[PDB]
């Protein structure tokens, strides 16, 4: 009391009440994104301190924009981020799953049960569920060259069914599949460019098997040179082409006016040497990351050539990959093997802007998207929707197993776990039962968002699954139950496996905390 | 009303804000109370069943942990006696690497018993001398309890079983997997006639799947990207430089001074030709990959791309040395074509992606190598941090086993036997120091009790049964965790062990800290600033 | 690569350095815990010049903190960005100098300079090739001026041909906080002249008259004055810390800026940085000497210095060399020579 142990202002809480409070906070976090799930899901608008707004349906984004400061609640944000990083789809199912796991075992915690029994039960249940998912998933060994594209198209269509571009999904899915059939063996995401141009309808978006990029700042003379070519050769450069000092360290000392004139002529001779070396290689289009002067612009205009400067590095690498040359930092050897080759080059007007198009390359490992919308958040949400489909297609190319969506696999796992629980005695039975009952929050949320009676549909689904109907889920349009494997609602098994592992890990971590201490400041 | 003005002398010359405590009632007992509070803070995180704890520091950083040293580091303690206890625990962590909670528990018990010894009538010097005598007797007794010395420290199946006990108390439910991983990583690098160095085990954390997807790699992984357009190699000769991959210049200021036009035309071509000659000379030795610790110039990169040389750069001054050790290469401060002896060799070098993270991997087909890496996968940063702490505990246990091979039973058997034999010794000491000695023995019962209190059972029955079964002559009987009713089990048969050296140092440091706290008589404190 | 170590002495020096390091750390991405979370690797091309990298990834400043009173270190440790420093680099005494030059230079400093010299040895042992030192202090105090000057002399003895730069605050024209300020300033300029390559004199009133009139809102304490000084120092040292179109260490600025070795005093400026050899310095010294003589003629407060060991002729030599400095500065204008003493007598006969 004269001298205290810790610094003044340290806040400590311990016992059952703090665990119950943590479980309560997780419910609020899950409620924040509860009604964004399914074909009938809405979306949220968030405004920050500066005034900019953002409209989203993606769970990870919404959780990121919320300034959560509760230590127990931050875990649900972390698991959503991890799920987004790994598979790219399913960042709301995991949150609801974790919250339901906590809420179903809250009453047992209230009775005074040791949390390690709960943790053991969760670990056993998760292992059993993952093994069942790996067992019952459908795969084809040597499917086809055409039955291997249709599967990816179905996966993309399912991935787009709850987004802003749902009505045009059949139009978009196709495109994204093509996008990932050109991306080599590493499938780098930087090889796909996304360009967003204001004005236009959503059906005016396009995919170019080639490259396209915006017009750069230009000097006088740019409007006096041709703007269409048929078989051009492209020179990609990393050299600054303008009249300038040779080096910052340079210094010139001279004694006669004749040598003064010679020095004056030397710079022009150097610049013209570079320009003639570029010209004699046969190139018709030149691109450079470094500035191009007005003298070079007029020189190229006088010989019917096209030039661009300050091109972004990503666009230049993309052009290299599409056309097949190499970036040159020197002009002393511009051979035929270091130049690109396209089939059409053009500059076109797209809704108030000018865009350069290189098209007609069949050896291209690159595609580019042009998205047409009506407002900034519209194209941003379109791009966010397309990213999920891209990631799903990449994951589906490697491992190709598919399970049915709509809640079929949730109910199958719930039935399996309930059948397993009756075998073992003790509190393990009750805990496995709670875990099994927590798995049917997905079909219930689908029905609730749609606007049905969830109790009747859940009873019918339970009866259908217990009898026999492995792939039976909810039909939203017909307001009933239906086979979701013949209605083509497919999704890779990695999504469910990762979601279960992450949700179980978060629940186990949150349950095992005894007390919380906060230091001042 | 009236006031009590002050006392003449030292009370009137003292500055404002300073404090002065003197005597037993104002100094000793308050210190004992503070130490008891500190011990009760961390008692609950002891054993396999101890619960996790969550701490937020003054920078709003989050820790979820069970380790006692980390908890004490993240807290902000103010009382000096608790500071002494914390420093003792930190010294134990630095010296051995495991057993930083035994120190706190034992010191708290010792001070708690010394309080009642002083209350009954004994003086501080007698308590101190009894504590030293008991500590010496305990150190004498301890070597006789040793069982099951380690046999072979380069056998994977024995090392995996030896390290399981040290991780069971941190990651209960995942001890086998982590134990096997750490065993492989440690057995990889132990050198012959070798000190085992701890630095040579690296940990890389990548957000992603569950813990069960973690792995061990014989080589290195960096979270970087390749500078050039070559991306993979299949048989790598490696040249390493500590200087920038660029044309090197004078230290004193230098200017290029030209007087005629021809020099002005020829300067740039001269520089380019020189740079090309240097790169081609480097490439002609057979090097496929160049690693540098500084800037890379554009022209140098262009010529590296021309000659198909993989170029990687990293700026740590420490990752470079560890890579040099890994591949057997020697760093070079000049940009010259290296000699064969300075060639590093690597089986594979490639750029890969794991769960949104791009990495560069230097990989060996060798089984030993020079260093190894552990790649951890988890759904949350805090979980991976806790797993890293468990890995550090396991590696330190392996190092201690390298230093000394003797094991003692765990789960409270050693403490019960020590208490029994110390009480038996103390019953034969005529004098006032016998009481202190007996108290010392009783202080050893705080370790089993805590375990039982964490397991959800009654400590009194467990202690009574342990005493009853030790009276018969079973020195390897301790607490049974699996049972829901109190029970006892043979620890040697079940493979629950702990190192001799850790127990030795823990007892020594705990007794030293307790005696040092007891020696202080009066405290003078300046005003906080 | 060509490391520089930084030394702060006194209350004012500590206050200025605590913000100098704060405004540097945010530029390089360092955190108050010592870790790094920057984005562009251009910040790491010249990181080693000011930070030493420890095992585990931490970065610690190459700084030594010195004072004769433990008051300011407690604030520095308890303040912001005060936990990245090495805990072994704090050197302090127990009494303090009490604004006496002689006590700082002879009595209390002599028993503590050895600790500073043993710390700088260990900080220099860890750098591949050091190039110089940075010092921050004051001319109106006891610990800042006398002890700082003694430290400068000792460093110059131990490290012969390494550069040395100082950032010294100077007494204000119309207000003097301390009664004995002219004595301390005059006795410290004498040994600042011959033991430094450049000095960056900073005035309190001149920079203090910016927050009221230019910043449009203030009734401040030393606070924002200190932050402005730190911003000026960062703008000075950006060339050392960062690469640009033309990078140049402080020697490469001095060689272009300092033609004559003994005229190496500057006056800064700031326009959001300007550094100038404006001869308006000759106006400042002309004032200080004007005060010094005015007191020395009366032998005021002299017994406070003589009792510590100094002699009476040290003041005479200091004032003589101050006059020499003033005349050397004056010989560069040839326009102030027009203001010679007006003739008062009437003897203007044959010759
Ligand atoms: N045509 C459909 N009929 C019924 N359910 C569907 C259909 N398409 C998708 N779903 C369901 O929508 C749910 C996911 O909605 P969504 O907002 O994408 O959540 P998440 O991002 O977590 O996958 C999945 O459980 C899936 O079963
Ligand atoms: N399987 C087990 N059953 C009972 N006790 C165990 C078991 N494994 C470890 N322990 C006990 O855990 C104690 C130490 O656990 P820990 O929390 O790491 O404390 P410390 O950090 O002080 O070593 C040891 O005394 C050991 O006896
Ligand atoms: Mg989804
Ligand atoms: Mg331990």
| Secondary structure (H, E, C), chain C | CCEEEEEEEHHHHHHHHHHHHHHHHHHHCECCCCCECCCCHHHHCCCCCCEEECCCCCEEECEEEECCCCHHHHHHHHCCCCCCCCHHHEECCCCCCCCCHHHHHHHCCCCCHHHHHHHHHHHHHCCCCEEEEEEEEECCCCHHHHHHHHHHHHHHHHCCCCEEEEEEEECCCCCCCCCCHHHHHHHHHHHHHCCCCEEECEEHHHHHHHHCCCCCCCCCCHHHHHHHHHHHHHHHHHHHHCCCCCCCCHHHHHHHHCCCCCCCEEEEECCCCEEECCCCHHHHHHHHHHHHHHHHCCCCCCHHHHCCCCCHHHHHHHHHHHHHHHHHHHCCCCCHHHCCCCCCCCCCCCC
A-interface mutation test, from B18, B41, B54, B528, most A Cβ less than 10 A away? B54
- Minimum CA distance residue for ligand 1 atom 27: A406
Determine if ligand 1 sits within 6 Å of the CB of residue A443.
no
Q: Which residues of A are catalytic?
A: 58, 91-92, 388
Among residues A59, A53, A70, the alpha carbon closest in space to that of A34 is found at A59
Strands B52-56, B62-65: pairing kind: antiparallel
Measured CA to CA, the distance from residue A315 to residue A121 in angstroms comes to 53
User: With an 8 Å Cβ cutoff, are A3 and B55 in contact?
Assistant: no
A-interface mutation test, from B380, B481, B527, most A Cβ less than 10 A away? B380
Q: Which residues are CB-contacts of A17 (< 8 A; sequence separation ≥ 6)?
A: none
Instruction: Quote the DSSP letter at residue B54.
Output: E
Alpha helix (H) residue ranges in A206-312: 257-279, 294-302
Give the residue numbers in B contacting C (CB under 8 Å), as ranges. 59, 253, 294-295, 315-318, 529
Q: What are the CA-CA distances from residue C332 to residues B297, C193, C235, C279, C336 (Å)?
A: 47, 18, 29, 9, 9
Alpha helix (H) residue ranges in B405-529: 413-426, 433-442, 446-455, 459-472, 491-494, 500-519
Measured CA to CA, the distance from residue B474 to residue B469 in angstroms comes to 6
Measured CA to CA, the distance from residue B140 to residue C243 in angstroms comes to 65
Q: Which residues are CB-contacts of B272 (< 8 A; sequence separation ≥ 6)?
A: A330, A332, B299
Q: Which residues are CB-contacts of B235 (< 8 A; sequence separation ≥ 6)?
A: B288, B347
Among residues B72, B63, B64, the alpha carbon closest in space to that of B100 is found at B72
Both tokens of B461, joined, read 């029955």
- A27, A113 in Cβ contact below 8 A? no
Instruction: Quote the DSSP letter at residue A190.
Output: G
Comparing alpha-carbon positions, the chain B residue that sits nearest to C41 is: B315
Burial class from Cβ neighbours inside 10 Å (0-12, 13-18, 19+) for residue C346 reads: exposed
Burial class from Cβ neighbours inside 10 Å (0-12, 13-18, 19+) for residue B31 reads: buried
Packed helices C181-193 and C148-158: angle between N→C axes, nearest 10 degrees: 10
Determine if ligand 2 sits within 6 Å of the CB of residue B496.
yes
Task: Residues C1-259: name the CATH superfamily.
Answer: Tubulin/FtsZ, GTPase domain (3.40.50.1440)
Q: Which residues are CB-contacts of C242 (< 8 A; sequence separation ≥ 6)?
A: C42, C43, C45, C46
Residue with tokens 């792995």: B215
Give the three-class secondary structure for B16.
coil
Distance (angstroms) between ligand 4 centre and the Cα of B202 equals 22
Measured CA to CA, the distance from residue C32 to residue A158 in angstroms comes to 47
Burial class from Cβ neighbours inside 10 Å (0-12, 13-18, 19+) for residue A402 reads: buried
Q: Please, which experimental method was used?
A: cryo-EM
**Burial readout A68-82 (b: 16 or more C-beta within 10 A, e: otherwise):** eeebbbbbbbbbbbb
Nearest to B315 among C44, C55, C74 (CB): C44
- Minimum CA distance residue for ligand 1 atom 24: A406
Measured CA to CA, the distance from residue A505 to residue A78 in angstroms comes to 11
**Burial readout B210-224 (b: 16 or more C-beta within 10 A, e: otherwise):** bbeebebbbbbbbee
Residues in chain C: 351
B54 contacts in chain A (CB < 8 Å): 71, 513, 515-517
Other Cβ atoms within 10 Å of A364 Cβ, number = 22
Give the three-class secondary structure for B10.
helix
Q: Which residues are CB-contacts of C297 (< 8 A; sequence separation ≥ 6)?
A: none
- Minimum CA distance residue for ligand 2 atom 27: B411
Alpha helix (H) residue ranges in A191-347: 257-279, 294-302, 313-323
Strands A285-288, A233-237: pairing kind: parallel
Measured CA to CA, the distance from residue C134 to residue C63 in angstroms comes to 9
Packed helices A257-279 and B261-283: angle between N→C axes, nearest 10 degrees: 40
Distance (angstroms) between ligand 2 centre and the Cα of B52 equals 15
Measured CA to CA, the distance from residue B377 to residue B212 in angstroms comes to 8
Measured CA to CA, the distance from residue A394 to residue A177 in angstroms comes to 9
Among residues A348, A62, A7, A409, the alpha carbon closest in space to that of A208 is found at A348
Measured CA to CA, the distance from residue A263 to residue B260 in angstroms comes to 7
Other Cβ atoms within 10 Å of C198 Cβ, number = 20
Q: Report whether A82 belongs to an annotated binding site.
A: no
Q: What are the CA-CA distances from residue C111 to residues A289, C54, C91 (Å)?
A: 62, 31, 12
- Minimum CA distance residue for ligand 1 atom 15: A38
Give the three-class secondary structure for A102.
helix
Residue A514 pairs in a beta bridge with none
- C139, C285 in Cβ contact below 8 A? no
Determine if ligand 1 sits within 6 Å of the CB of residue A37.
yes
- B436, B122 in Cβ contact below 8 A? yes
Strands A210-214, A402-404: pairing kind: unpaired
What are the binding residues of C?
11, 69, 138, 142-144, 204, 226
User: With an 8 Å Cβ cutoff, are B315 and C75 in contact?
Assistant: no
Q: Which residues are CB-contacts of B20 (< 8 A; sequence separation ≥ 6)?
A: B10, B14, B522, B523, B524, B525
Measured CA to CA, the distance from residue C33 to residue C218 in angstroms comes to 32
Both tokens of B412, joined, read 């409270």
- C44, C50 in Cβ contact below 8 A? no
Task: Return the ligand number nearest the Cα of B505.
Answer: 2
Q: Which residues are CB-contacts of B244 (< 8 A; sequence separation ≥ 6)?
A: B292, B294, B295, B296, B297
User: With an 8 Å Cβ cutoff, are B64 and A509 in contact?
Assistant: yes
Distance (angstroms) between ligand 2 centre and the Cα of A39 equals 52
**Which ligand 1 atom lies nearest to the CA of residue A36?**
17
- C165, C197 in Cβ contact below 8 A? yes
Q: Which residues are CB-contacts of C166 (< 8 A; sequence separation ≥ 6)?
A: C135, C136, C137, C152, C192, C196, C198, C199, C200
Both tokens of A318, joined, read 């993309």
**E strands, B196-346, in order:** 201-207, 215-217, 219-222, 232-233, 236-241, 256-258, 289-292, 310-313, 344-346
Both tokens of A288, joined, read 């450079």
Mutate to test the pocket of ligand 2, among B90, B108, B169 (most ligand atoms within 8 A of CB): B169
Measured CA to CA, the distance from residue C3 to residue C52 in angstroms comes to 9
CATH of the domain at B352: 3.50.7.10
Measured CA to CA, the distance from residue A521 to residue B71 in angstroms comes to 18
CA atoms within 13 A on the CB side of B133: 20
Q: Report whether B411 belongs to an annotated binding site.
A: yes
User: With an 8 Å Cβ cutoff, are B59 and C33 in contact?
Assistant: yes
The distance of A41 to chain B (nearest Cα, Å) reads: 27
- A182, A411 in Cβ contact below 8 A? no
User: Which structural domain range is residue B260 located in?
Assistant: 219-403
Angle in degrees, CA C112, C118, C123, rounded to 5: 130
Measured in angstroms, the resolution is 2.9
Among residues B234, B321, B332, B208, the alpha carbon closest in space to that of B282 is found at B332
Q: Report whether B194 belongs to an annotated binding site.
A: no
Other Cβ atoms within 10 Å of A515 Cβ, number = 18
Q: Report whether A161 belongs to an annotated binding site.
A: yes
Chain discontinuities in chain C, listed by preceding residue (C to N exceeding 2.5 Å) = 272
Measured CA to CA, the distance from residue B52 to residue C82 in angstroms comes to 31
Cα A37 to its chain centre, rounded Å, is: 18
- B52, A514 in Cβ contact below 8 A? yes
Determine if ligand 2 sits within 6 Å of the CB of residue B100.
yes
In the CATH hierarchy, which top-level class contains the domain A210-397? alpha beta
A63 contacts in chain B (CB < 8 Å): none
Q: What are the CA-CA distances from residue A16 to residues A109, A507, B200, C2 (Å)?
A: 8, 16, 43, 59
Residue B359 pairs in a beta bridge with B352
Q: Report whether B503 belongs to an annotated binding site.
A: yes
- B47, A56 in Cβ contact below 8 A? no
Comparing alpha-carbon positions, the chain B residue that sits nearest to C252 is: B253
Both tokens of C245, joined, read 């179109």
3-state DSSP of B66-79: CCHHHHHHHCCECC
Both tokens of C284, joined, read 């400042």
CA atoms within 13 A on the CB side of B136: 6
Handedness of CA B170, B174, B178, B183 (dihedral sign): positive
Packed helices B459-472 and B446-455: angle between N→C axes, nearest 10 degrees: 130
Comparing alpha-carbon positions, the chain A residue that sits nearest to B49 is: A116
Q: Which residues are CB-contacts of C209 (< 8 A; sequence separation ≥ 6)?
A: none
A86 contacts in chain B (CB < 8 Å): 207-209, 355-356
Q: What are the CA-CA distances from residue A364 to residues A196, A322, A324, A339 (Å)?
A: 22, 4, 8, 15
Residue with tokens 């690109």: A340
- Spell out the long-range contacts of A341-349 with Cβ–Cβ below 8 A and sequence spacing 24 or more: A341/A231, A341/A232, A341/A233, A341/A234, A342/A210, A342/A232, A342/A234, A343/A230, A343/A231, A344/A228, A344/A229, A344/A230, A345/A228, A345/A229, A345/A232, A345/A285, A345/A306, A346/A227, A346/A228, A347/A215, A347/A227, A347/A228
CATH 1.10.287.600 correct for C281-337: yes
Among residues C115, C142, C116, C118, the alpha carbon closest in space to that of C13 is found at C142
Angle in degrees, CA C186, C191, C192, rounded to 5: 90
Measured CA to CA, the distance from residue B77 to residue B60 in angstroms comes to 17
Among residues C142, C169, C164, C173, the alpha carbon closest in space to that of C228 is found at C169
Give the three-class secondary structure for A374.
coil
Instruction: Quote the DSSP letter at residue B24.
Output: I
**Which ligand 1 atom lies nearest to the CA of residue A90?**
22
Other Cβ atoms within 10 Å of B116 Cβ, number = 12
Neighbours of chain C (3+ CB pairs under 8 A): B
Measured CA to CA, the distance from residue B422 to residue B402 in angstroms comes to 30
């Amino acid at each position: 009391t004269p001298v205290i142990l810790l610094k003044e202002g340290t806040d400590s809480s311990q016992g059952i009440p703090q665990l119950v409070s943590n479980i309560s906070a997780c419910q609020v976090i899950a409620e924040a994104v509860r009604t964004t799930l399914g074909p009938r899901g809405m979306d949220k608008l968030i405004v920050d301190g500066r005034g900019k707004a953002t409209i989203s349906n993606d769970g990870a984004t919404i959780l990121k924009l919320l300034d959560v400061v509760h230590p127990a609640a931050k875990t649900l944000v972390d698991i959503a981020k991890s799920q987004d990083a790994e598979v790219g789809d399913g960042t709301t199912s995991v949150t609801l799953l974790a919250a339901e796991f906590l809420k179903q075992v809250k009453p047992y915690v209230e009775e005074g049960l040791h949390p390690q029994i709960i943790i053991r039960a969760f670990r056993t249940a998760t292992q059993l569920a993952v093994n069942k998912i790996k067992e019952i998933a459908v795969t084809v060994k040597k499917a086809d060259k055409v039955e291997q594209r249709k599967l990816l198209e179905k996966c993309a269509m399912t991935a787009l069914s709850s987004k802003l571009i749902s009505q045009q999904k059949a139009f978009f899915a196709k495109m994204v599949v093509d996008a990932v059939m050109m991306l080599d063996d590493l499938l780098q995401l930087k090889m796909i460019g996304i360009k967003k141009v204001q004005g236009g309808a959503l059906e005016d978006s396009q995919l170019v098997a080639g490259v396209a990029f915006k017009k750069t700042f230009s000097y006088a003379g740019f409007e006096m040179q041709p703007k269409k070519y048929h078989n051009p050769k492209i020179a990609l450069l990393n050299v600054e082409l303008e009249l300038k000092a040779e080096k910052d360290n340079a210094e010139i000392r001279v004694h006669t006016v004749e040598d003064y004139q010679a020095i004056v002529d030397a710079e022009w001779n150097i610049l013209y040497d570079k320009l003639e070396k570029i010209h004699h290689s046969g190139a018709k289009v030149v691109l450079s990351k470094l500035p191009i002067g007005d003298v070079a612009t007029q020189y190229f205009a006088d010989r019917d050539m096209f030039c661009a400067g300050r091109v972004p590095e990503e666009d230049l690498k993309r052009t290299m990959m599409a056309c097949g040359g190499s970036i040159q930092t020197s002009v002393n050897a511009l051979s035929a093997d270091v130049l690109g080759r396209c089939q059409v080059f053009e500059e076109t007007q797209i809704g108030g802007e000018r865009y350069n198009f290189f098209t007609g390359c069949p050896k291209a490992k690159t595609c580019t998207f042009i998205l047409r919308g009506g407002a900034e958040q519209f194209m941003e949400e379109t791009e966010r929707s397309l990213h999920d489909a891209i990631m799903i297609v990449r994951r589906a190319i490697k491992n190709d197993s598919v399970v049915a969506g709509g809640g079929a696999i949730e109910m199958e796992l719930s039935k399996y776990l309930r059948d397993y629980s009756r075998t073992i005695p003790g509190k393990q039975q009750l805990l496995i039962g709670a875990y099994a009952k927590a798995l049917e929050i997905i079909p219930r949320q689908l029905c609730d968002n749609a606007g049905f009676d969830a109790t009747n549909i859940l009873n019918k689904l339970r009866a259908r699954h217990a009898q026999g109907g492995t792939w039976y889920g909810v039909d939203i349009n017909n307001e009933d139950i239906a086979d979701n494997f013949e209605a083509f609602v497919w999704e890779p098994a990695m999504v469910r496996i990762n979601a279960l592992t992450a949700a179980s890990e978060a629940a186990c971590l949150i349950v095992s905390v005894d007390e919380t201490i906060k230091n001042p400041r | 009303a009236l006031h009590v003005p002050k006392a003449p002398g030292f009370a009137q010359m003292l500055k404002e804000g300073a404090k002065h405590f003197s005597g037993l009632e104002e100094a000793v007992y308050r210190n004992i109370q503070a130490c008891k509070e500190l011990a009760q803070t961390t008692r609950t995180a002891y054993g396999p069943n101890g619960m996790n704890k969550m701490v937020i520091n003054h920078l709003e950083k989050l820790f979820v942990t069970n380790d006692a040293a980390t908890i004490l580091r993240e807290l902000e303690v103010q009382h000096p006696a608790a500071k002494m206890i914390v420093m003792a625990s930190h010294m134990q962590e630095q010296e051995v690497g495991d057993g930083t909670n035994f120190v706190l528990v034992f010191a708290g018990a010792l001070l708690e018993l010394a309080e009642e010894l002083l209350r009954i009538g004994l003086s501080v010097s007698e308590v101190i001398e009894g504590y030293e005598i008991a500590c010496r007797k305990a150190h004498e007794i301890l070597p006789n309890l040793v069982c099951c010395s380690a046999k072979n420290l380069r056998d994977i199946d024995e090392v995996s079983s030896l390290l399981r006990t040290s991780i069971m108390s941190k990651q209960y439910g995942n001890e086998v997997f982590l134990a096997k991983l750490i065993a492989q990583a440690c057995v990889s690098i132990f050198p012959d006639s070798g000190h085992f160095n701890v630095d040579n085990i690296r940990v890389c954390k990548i957000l992603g799947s569950g813990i069960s997807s973690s792995s061990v790699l014989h080589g290195m992984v960096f979270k970087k990207e390749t500078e050039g357009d070559v991306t993979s190699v299949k048989d790598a000769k490696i040249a390493v430089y500590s200087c920038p991959f660029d044309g090197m210049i004078t230290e004193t200021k230098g200017t290029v001074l030209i007087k005629t036009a021809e020099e002005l035309m020829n300067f740039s071509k001269g520089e380019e030709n020189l740079m090309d000659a240097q790169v081609k000379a480097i490439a002609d030795t057979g090097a496929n990959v160049v690693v540098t610790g500084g800037k890379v110039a554009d022209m140098a990169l262009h010529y590296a791309n021309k000659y198909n040389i993989m170029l990687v750069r990293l700026n740590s001054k420490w990752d470079l040395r560890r890579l040099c050790k890994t591949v057997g290469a020697t760093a070079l401060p000049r940009l010259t074509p290296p000699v064969l002896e300075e060639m590093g060799h690597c089986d594979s070098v490639y750029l890969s992606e794991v769960g949104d993270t791009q990495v560069v991997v230097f990989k060996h087909e060798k089984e030993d190598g020079a260093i190894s890496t552990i790649v951890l996968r988890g759904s949350t940063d805090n979980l991976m941090d806790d797993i890293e702490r468990a890995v550090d505990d396991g590696v330190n246990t392996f190092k201690v086993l390298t230093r000394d091979k003797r094991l003692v039973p765990g789960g409270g058997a050693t403490e019960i036997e020590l208490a029994k034999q110390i009480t038996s010794y103390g019953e034969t000491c005529p004098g006032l120091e016998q009481y202190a000695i007996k108290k010392f023995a009783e202080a050893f019962e705080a370790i089993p009790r805590a375990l039982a209190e964490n397991s959800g059972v009654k400590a009194n029955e467990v202690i009574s049964k342990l005493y009853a079964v030790h009276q018969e002559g079973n020195k390897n009987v301790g607490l049974d965790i699996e049972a829901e009713v109190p029970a006892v089990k043979d620890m040697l048969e079940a493979g629950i062990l702990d190192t001799y050296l850790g127990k030795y140092w823990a007892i020594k440091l705990a007794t030293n800290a307790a005696v040092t706290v007891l020696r202080v008589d009066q405290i003078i404190m300046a005003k906080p600033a | 690569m060509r490391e520089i170590v930084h030394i702060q002495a006194g209350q004012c020096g500590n206050q200025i350095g605590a913000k100098f390091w704060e405004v540097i750390s945010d530029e390089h991405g360092i955190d108050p815990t010592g870790t790094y979370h920057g984005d562009s690797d251009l910040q790491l091309d010249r990181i080693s010049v000011y930070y030493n990298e420890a095992t585990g990834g931490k970065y610690v400043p190459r700084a030594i903190l010195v004072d004769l009173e433990p008051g300011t270190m407690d604030s520095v440790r308890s303040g912001p960005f005060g936990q990245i420093f090495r805990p072994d680099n704090f050197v302090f005494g127990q009494s303090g100098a009490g604004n006496n030059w002689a006590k700082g230079h002879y009595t209390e400093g002599a028993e503590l300079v050895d600790s500073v010299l043993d710390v700088v040895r260990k900080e220099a042992e860890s750098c591949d090739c050091l190039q110089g030192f940075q010092l921050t202090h004051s001319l109106g105090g006891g610990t800042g001026s006398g002890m700082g000057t003694l430290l400068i002399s000792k460093i110059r003895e131990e490290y012969p041909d390494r550069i040395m730069n100082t950032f010294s605050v100077v007494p204000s024209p119309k207000v003097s906080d301390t009664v004995v300020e002219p004595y301390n300033a005059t006795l410290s300029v004498h040994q600042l002249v011959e033991n430094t390559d450049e000095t960056y004199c900073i005035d309190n009133e001149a920079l203090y008259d910016i927050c009221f009139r230019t910043l449009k809102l203030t009734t401040p304490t030393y606070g924002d004055l200190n932050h402005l000084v730190s911003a000026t120092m960062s703008g000075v040292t950006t060339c050392l810390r960062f690469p640009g179109q033309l990078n140049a260490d402080l020697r490469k600025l001095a060689v272009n800026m300092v033609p004559f070795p003994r005229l190496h005093f500057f006056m800064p400026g700031f326009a959001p940085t300007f550094i100038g050899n404006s001869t308006a310095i000759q106006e400042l010294f002309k004032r200080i000497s004007e005060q010094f003589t005015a007191m020395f003629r009366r032998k005021a407060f002299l017994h406070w210095y003589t009792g510590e060991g100094m002699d009476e002729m040290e003041f005479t030599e200091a004032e003589s060399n101050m006059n020499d400095l003033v005349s050397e500065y004056q010989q560069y204008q040839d326009a102030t020579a027009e203001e010679e003493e007006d003739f008062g007598e009437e003897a203007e006969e044959e010759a």
